[PDB]
């Protein structure tokens, strides 16, 4: 446990320091400097807002992982709610970016109206409202326990059936449905990019479409690569709960260490947008 106690706060601090600066800079440059805010840039501004809102609560994670939780039940609930909101909003904003790309490339002439509407009004109803409504479990179950010698801030379900159900719902809504939408959109997009001689009817529009499309591909690939090993770990853990996989307690302890370390490392997704602006904005 000493290695985890030394390792988790270090990663949390690194991610907090990088994410605060990156997301604050992105939000300033886009919103308050009124610079480039095209459709994909509007979506990425939403992404950075959610990322900053989550990152501003990482010191609580570090303090909980090091020593204890002396903050209170209200703060426990608040940090849980923020975590869930960011977790779902990020992946669904990515799905909306993918859908916008499909509309822009496949239907390159009549998409202006259902490319303005989908980015101006449908985005809120399709991203933020379900994200907020999915935090009801974080309003009901998030509580501070009274474990021996230290307090614990975590969600407390009546039993393990809710744990399995919410793990599966998290897996679905955060990996599969947005993943399926992105697979469909980008499969069609790539089938069109390597077969259509010239998108739209001019060279400049073609190259603009390619240049706008590529960073979204890199961002989606980085996001899914960052989040995948955590999903593998929680899938094995769920199968352990489902009693399909039976091994010794050493196996469960190793899986739990794997999951904790991999979640701490998967929190690196909050730094993808600023890093991508840095690399591609040369």
């Amino acid at each position, epitope marked *: 446990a000493n290695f985890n106690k030394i390792f988790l706060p270090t990663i949390y601090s690194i991610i907090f320091l990088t994410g605060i600066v990156g997301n604050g800079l992105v939000i300033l440059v886009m919103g308050y400097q009124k610079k480039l805010r095209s459709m994909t840039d509007k979506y990425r501004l939403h992404l950075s807002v959610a990322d900053l809102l989550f990152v501003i609560t990482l010191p609580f994670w570090a303090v909980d992982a090091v020593a204890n939780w002396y903050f209170g039940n209200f703060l426990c609930k608040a940090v849980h709610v923020i975590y869930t909101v960011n977790l779902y909003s990020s992946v669904w904003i990515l799905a909306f970016i993918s859908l916008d790309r499909y509309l822009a490339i496949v239907h390159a002439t009549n998409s202006q109206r259902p490319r303005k509407l989908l980015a101006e009004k449908v985005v809120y109803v399709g991203v933020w409202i379900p994200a907020l409504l999915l935090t009801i479990p974080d309003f009901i179950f998030a509580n501070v326990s009274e474990a021996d010698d230290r307090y614990i801030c975590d969600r407390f379900y009546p039993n393990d059936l809710w744990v399995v159900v919410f793990q599966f719902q998290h897996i679905m809504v955060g990996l599969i449905l947005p993943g399926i939408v992105i697979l469909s959109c980008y499969c069609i997009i*790539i089938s069109r*990019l*390597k077969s259509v*001689r*010239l998108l739209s009817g001019s*060279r400049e529009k*073609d190259r603009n479409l*390619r240049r706008i*499309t590529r960073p979204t591909v890199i961002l989606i690939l980085a996001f899914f690569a960052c989040w995948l090993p955590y999903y593998i770990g929680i899938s094995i853990d769920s199968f352990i709960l489902l009693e399909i996989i039976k091994q010794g307690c050493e196996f469960e302890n190793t899986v739990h260490k794997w999951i904790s370390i991999t979640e701490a490392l998967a929190f690196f997704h909050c730094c993808l947008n600023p890093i991508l602006y840095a690399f591609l904005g040369a």
Partner: nanobody
Amino acid sequence: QVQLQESGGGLVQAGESLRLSCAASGTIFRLYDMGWYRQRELVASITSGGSTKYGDSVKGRFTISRDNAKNTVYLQMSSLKPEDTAVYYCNAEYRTGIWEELLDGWGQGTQVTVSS
């Protein structure tokens, strides 16, 4: 960048047969359009799908062919005329990657003279 090599020139007699070969070599991801030109009058252009578009003076005398596997375009010269004695340039539209823009290439130039 890609490289295009032209061959098929020399001394030929009027009304005889020839076969110009234009091979594309280099960093190629996909070839879209390949044609023969002559300012640059289109005498024969074949797309990747085979949609040939012969010129006004090339009707009945010039037949084009394409081998996408070999990345080459073949033009057949038949019923040569004194007006056909000119330098022929091979054109190809390519692309080096999925995210890259459309690019245009040109060949060195092949000179064909009809004996009389």
